[PDB]
Amino acid sequence: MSLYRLIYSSQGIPNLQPQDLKDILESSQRNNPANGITGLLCYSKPAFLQVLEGECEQVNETYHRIVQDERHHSPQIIECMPIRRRNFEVWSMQAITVNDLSTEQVKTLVLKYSGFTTLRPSAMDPEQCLNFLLDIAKIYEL
Amino acid sequence: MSLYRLIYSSQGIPNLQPQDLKDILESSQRNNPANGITGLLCYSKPAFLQVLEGECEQVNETYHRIVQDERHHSPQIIECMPIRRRNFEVWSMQAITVNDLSTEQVKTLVLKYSGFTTLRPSAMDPEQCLNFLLDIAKI
Amino acid sequence: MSLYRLIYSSQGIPNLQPQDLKDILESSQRNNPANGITGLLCYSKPAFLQVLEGECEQVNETYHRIVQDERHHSPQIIECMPIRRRNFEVWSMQAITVNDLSTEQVKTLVLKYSGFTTLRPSAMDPEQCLNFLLDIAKIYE
Amino acid sequence: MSLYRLIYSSQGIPNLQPQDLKDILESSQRNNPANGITGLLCYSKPAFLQVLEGECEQVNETYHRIVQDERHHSPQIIECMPIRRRNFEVWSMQAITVNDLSTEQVKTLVLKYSGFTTLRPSAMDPEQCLNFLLDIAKIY
Amino acid sequence: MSLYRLIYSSQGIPNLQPQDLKDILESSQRNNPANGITGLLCYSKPAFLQVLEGECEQVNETYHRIVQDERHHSPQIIECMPIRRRNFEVWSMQAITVNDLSTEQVKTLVLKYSGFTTLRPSAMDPEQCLNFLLDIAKIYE
Amino acid sequence: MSLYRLIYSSQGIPNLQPQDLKDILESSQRNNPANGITGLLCYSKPAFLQVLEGECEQVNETYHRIVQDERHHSPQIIECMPIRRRNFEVMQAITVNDLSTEQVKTLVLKYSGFTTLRPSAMDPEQCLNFLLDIAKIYE
Amino acid sequence: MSLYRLIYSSQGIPNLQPQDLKDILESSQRNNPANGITGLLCYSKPAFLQVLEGECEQVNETYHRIVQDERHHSPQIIECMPIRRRNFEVWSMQAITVNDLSTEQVKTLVLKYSGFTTLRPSAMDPEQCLNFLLDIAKIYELSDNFF
Amino acid sequence: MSLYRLIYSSQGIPNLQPQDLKDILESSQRNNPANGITGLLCYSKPAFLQVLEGECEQVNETYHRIVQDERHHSPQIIECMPIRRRNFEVWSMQAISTEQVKTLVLKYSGFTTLRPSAMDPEQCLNFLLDIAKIYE
Amino acid sequence: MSLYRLIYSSQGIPNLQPQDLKDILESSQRNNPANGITGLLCYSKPAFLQVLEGECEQVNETYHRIVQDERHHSPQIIECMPIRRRNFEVWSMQAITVNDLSTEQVKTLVLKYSGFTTLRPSAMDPEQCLNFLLDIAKIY
Amino acid sequence: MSLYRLIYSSQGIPNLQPQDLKDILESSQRNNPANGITGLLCYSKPAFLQVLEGECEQVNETYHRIVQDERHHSPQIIECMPIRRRNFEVWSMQAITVNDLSTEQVKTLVLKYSGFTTLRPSAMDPEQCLNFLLDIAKIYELSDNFFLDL
């Protein structure tokens, strides 16, 4: 019913290739529009960080389906709450890799909101997660 | 006396034609100026979403007249409260249709405040309804 | 779906007797329960002040039905909004008459939230109506 | 329409007596009920401090009538504003005299909101005025 | 003593001419400098809306003088309070007529803070009055 | 690491029996202490509504273990967030239906639209307040 | 006009005797109540800490009178500002002495608001000074705090 | 060693000549910089109004020195308190026509002549900050 | 000069005996009074949790002298800041050891602010730490 | 885990030449990146004022290592608390000499937050130190002013 946001992180499996993230993105871009789901996925080997926005029932359907995926494990819900309005509404889904090859502007962003230059969501509170995702969206948009 | 704003939604009757939407707009534009009413009507098949601003007595009189209109049914008052100042003061009544022929800019605005690309007032709270309406008035 | 409150006032017909009010109470106490509606009606000749709480769809269904009642006219919605929780949850409906013959305590309460000792709903803001209705529900009344 | 409170002070004519305050009281208690006015009057030689509460129009009517009374001059409105609810509702009007011969508990209240033990409205702000009057009403 | 603002409205007598408002304006612009009074007056037939600023003592002195004026009646104090700083300090007094001949911009402003396009202080709360006066003075300029 | 609270609802299977409720209770009370999980489970046929409290990692492990339970479906997370202190800090379970006391029904009505518990129609604050109030009036 | 509070500290001249302290408090009892001043004087040898509340003009007249007293030097205004209401109550006739033979309760109160068991106003902010003075007035029981 | 602000008013002696104000100016400009005192002294016959900013001990030393000055009497501390930061990066003096100045004295007080006894601390501060702007 | 609080946690060395804890507590109760330090110490093997109150200079000198003690390592400052007033003014130092054991009175407090019944400082933010210590002292 | 900021001041040894400051900056810039530490060091003879930001564990590790440096003594922690985001994230370490030879612009920032034109960290409360440091970081591009002063 109500407009909702869910932020979670997970451990990618050890063997993940760049093609595996193309298969996640394409699936998400195929399923998400029809469900009202918008969002952003960050990968920083081996951690995933994703925000999902949408009707509560749809966000939940999508999350609990994602939890069942064989390409990641130990999902940790970081925040889930009703929202006043969407922030990621221009993307059914988008994917960003944050690594050592990343732009200095991007590295300085990871640091602005966390302890290290490599993204580790398990060490960030919901507001730091949301703000990182907002700012990094802002520099890859659209 | 007191300046008020009422937001409500309703379900248009099934066979609502383009002429129907036009005479609703024409009625509101001739009646509202005289009663101090301003606002915006949005129509998203089959739902209507309207904000009315004016003196409490006038907003109530206007609203209870609209309620009796044969072209819609099941009105749902979403918010009715006194307000500090108007936001739609330049329009006695403005109408927008939000549908599959709407621009990505509109579809995106509907998405920003709700579960889908199609407007469904029943799935929005008062602040979401008002902000959608304020933003769409800002094209 | 969501929990709502609607407060409104109306003008009763000049022809309102003991039996018409009791008929309103009876109808409301019969219909309100099945629809999850709770609240309180006050009658201060000639005015009605009523508060309705419940699911948005129900509140609206009940209100728009009440507006068709020939026993009053010129309904004025005072406030309609989502609420954190109910305050009248114990009564599907109750009806108080507030007038000249009312208790000094009740009179003083009316004066607490308005200009006079006779209840005139069109001279109160939403917070004053609500608090009046909360305090008089507590007295009983 | 709107519920209002008006607080003002004035200078009473030099030699006001218990009886002068008694008929002010009797005048107010007959007039105030029908106008739905409530409130409290303080006299601290030589000055008056009154709060009036009621419908905007009635508060204004009452105040502007009072201004014309011969028993005082130089009225100063301290505060006039809409209010959420009344604080002096049980009293159409009461009068308390506050002087050097008062109770120690009342004297202590004067001191709490002002520079001296004599009540001097002109030397108090709107919040100090209302608060004095609220505490004063509380011990009555 | 303290810096104060008083806002009131009143009813002008039935047939006020532009010359009466000039006289009012001239009287105020001669008396107000010396008393440190500043403010703005609007006339919206038949009503007056004025804001006065100055020392509490002088603001009361001026207001109780104005109230004796035979050119209006039934004065209503809308607000009287201390203030941190003046907003009308550039003008000893200015007078503006707000009626059905004012510009669209002025009419729109009246609508922004009130139920109609004609200015009726009785229909406005103190915040609405103050904001109307700040905004209209800004256009004037 | 961080003290968290998660509130969710779900749909019990149609053939749930009081013995299943007792089995859920036995299991919880065996698993929760060692994991430092506290909270309250409520059952209003066919709906469950649970709040969990404890460390982030343990709330997540317990929640995702619960999601796989075949005695319910369609979980819907209502709120998940860090908290400054526990409210419950003693798993208790309670069933809340149209046979519960007139005291419980009045409590259901206080936070929602009807006398029967329907979490889908309550926001996070109403859910939590309901659970506290229902716990308060029990043990 | 306005209701004011002033808190100040000073350094009493060396070897101030109890009779001098008595002379000061006799003067302050003589003048303060007539001037509508309430407050307290504390003495933690050699330092004075005093609060004065009352009408701005009186608090100032009193303070600038005190400044000229030859029995202390280096006055330091800690705070002076308009207040919404008084927190003392009366002018405390008795001064409080706060030193190393003070009760464990008084010493604990000094420690609650500063770094040590001896009272050093130069180490405290205006709110610490006020709260100390309020708590000590409560224990003595000179005043509290209009109930 | 806390950063502090003190605002006070006083009445200049009836005999105050332009050279007295010049004397005050030159003493303060020699002393204040070495004591880390910034602020502003305004004089409009017969009132002085001054803000001093600096370390507590210096602000107090400077103020109580000023108190002993024979060119004014009846000092009234209007405010004295710790501050988060300074608002005057330098020290200045201004003696107060025209209408801009009229308008300014009015903006934060009841009359068109400067009367500190009728202004609260925030009014005094903002007046002093603004008058530094219309000059200075 | 200024009134400060510092809360820190550290890791005791593997083989601490109850005697060593007495030696720390005795040393602290000997040294703190003269430096104006008050506070509270817990040992939940292996973790130490201490709050130190006092003048900034003394709090720091004591903290840094403590860091050098051979009976713990890895000190983690959790919060350090000026405070309005002390909350532990009555104790030069008190030590809470395994009457952390007190079943669901003290264990009840630990759960109230953290994930488990056993006290682990690294699992608590500054506010949870202070509130725990405040509640624990209250019941003493 | 938690993102933290630590501000402290210490007394530098009376010897310190520009090479010593360079050696300090050099170690910090080599060590800090790996540790996720960022911040700013000011040297106002004889005093240092530093802010460190990073993970609580790493900030603490770095700080207690620094305390053991023979080039200063009497370290005083001014504030240590969790933070919502970094403010000094641009440099692993930036170091600025702030003294009587400083620009009038710098001396004005010093005076804005304290009693005098000479930076004396103990004459400043935590918010004053913080704001002072933020204002300095604002005006200095370059990770130091030892080679060029603006």
Ligand SMILES: Cc1cc2nc3c(=O)[nH]c(=O)nc-3n(C[C@H](O)[C@H](O)[C@H](O)COP(=O)(O)O)c2cc1C
């Ligand atoms: C990190 C991660 C994030 C994912 N995010 C989404 C999502 O945004 N939307 C979605 O439909 N599937 C998402 N999935 C993919 C689904 O788990 C699953 O692969 C998808 O339902 C396959 O559907 P398909 O066969 O139609 O392509 C995600 C998977 C992973 C591992």
Ligand SMILES: Cc1cc2nc3c(=O)[nH]c(=O)nc-3n(C[C@H](O)[C@H](O)[C@H](O)COP(=O)(O)O)c2cc1C
């Ligand atoms: C969704 C909808 C919105 C309407 N909004 C307004 C309105 O804002 N103002 C108005 O006067 N009439 C409004 N009406 C039109 C009235 O229902 C009614 O037809 C009209 O006031 C008739 O006036 P007339 O008979 O003079 O043409 C609305 C009708 C519909 C169904």
Ligand SMILES: Cc1cc2nc3c(=O)[nH]c(=O)nc-3n(C[C@H](O)[C@H](O)[C@H](O)COP(=O)(O)O)c2cc1C
């Ligand atoms: C002032 C007033 C208040 C009323 N309030 C309610 C109400 O709370 N609930 C309700 O069902 N009917 C209420 N009604 C009565 C309805 O108008 C209507 O008569 C009722 O639904 C008739 O149902 P019945 O024919 O089954 O008796 C109210 C009527 C009036 C005049």
Ligand SMILES: Cc1cc2nc3c(=O)[nH]c(=O)nc-3n(C[C@H](O)[C@H](O)[C@H](O)COP(=O)(O)O)c2cc1C
């Ligand atoms: C300070 C003071 C307060 C007064 N307050 C009231 C009042 O509250 N209500 C009122 O009717 N008259 C009040 N008056 C008295 C009126 O001025 C006047 O005497 C009286 O209302 C005349 O009424 P009467 O013709 O019924 O005797 C007050 C007079 C004074 C000087």
Ligand SMILES: Cc1cc2nc3c(=O)[nH]c(=O)nc-3n(C[C@H](O)[C@H](O)[C@H](O)COP(=O)(O)O)c2cc1C
């Ligand atoms: C609505 C209106 C507003 C007025 N405002 C002022 C005012 O601001 N200042 C003033 O001195 N007189 C004002 N007056 C005029 C006075 O009522 C009065 O006639 C005038 O001050 C007489 O003073 P004089 O005899 O010295 O000329 C106003 C009058 C009206 C009716």
Ligand SMILES: Cc1cc2nc3c(=O)[nH]c(=O)nc-3n(C[C@H](O)[C@H](O)[C@H](O)COP(=O)(O)O)c2cc1C
């Ligand atoms: C709606 C519902 C709520 C549950 N809540 C909890 C819980 O609070 N803690 C828990 O350990 N298991 C909970 N479970 C039970 C688990 O799903 C699972 O059956 C159980 O933990 C297995 O433990 P066991 O086999 O060792 O007994 C819940 C199950 C259901 C269906």
Ligand SMILES: Cc1cc2nc3c(=O)[nH]c(=O)nc-3n(C[C@H](O)[C@H](O)[C@H](O)COP(=O)(O)O)c2cc1C
């Ligand atoms: C530390 C100290 C505090 C004082 N406090 C007050 C006081 O609060 N009120 C007062 O009148 N005099 C106070 N005085 C005394 C005055 O300096 C002065 O001696 C007094 O005004 C003399 O009045 P007398 O001539 O009646 O004795 C204080 C003196 C000292 C040194």
Ligand SMILES: Cc1cc2nc3c(=O)[nH]c(=O)nc-3n(C[C@H](O)[C@H](O)[C@H](O)COP(=O)(O)O)c2cc1C
């Ligand atoms: C109203 C007024 C304001 C003053 N302000 C300052 C000041 O800010 N700084 C200062 O050193 N002296 C100020 N003084 C001057 C001192 O009273 C004193 O005369 C001066 O500091 C003596 O220094 P000199 O002996 O070197 O000339 C002020 C004096 C007056 C009357």
Ligand SMILES: Cc1cc2nc3c(=O)[nH]c(=O)nc-3n(C[C@H](O)[C@H](O)[C@H](O)COP(=O)(O)O)c2cc1C
């Ligand atoms: C965890 C812990 C807490 C301590 N707390 C204090 C303290 O609060 N005050 C203190 O003086 N020493 C404290 N110490 C002990 C000092 O490190 C040191 O051993 C002792 O104070 C030296 O004094 P002594 O040689 O006179 O016995 C603490 C030590 C440990 C490891």
Ligand SMILES: Cc1cc2nc3c(=O)[nH]c(=O)nc-3n(C[C@H](O)[C@H](O)[C@H](O)COP(=O)(O)O)c2cc1C
């Ligand atoms: C005031 C001052 C600040 C310092 N700041 C840091 C710092 O931020 N990071 C760091 O690694 N070392 C810092 N140090 C230097 C360390 O104490 C130590 O010399 C260095 O980390 C050892 O690194 P090395 O392997 O190059 O010898 C600082 C030293 C001083 C005296």
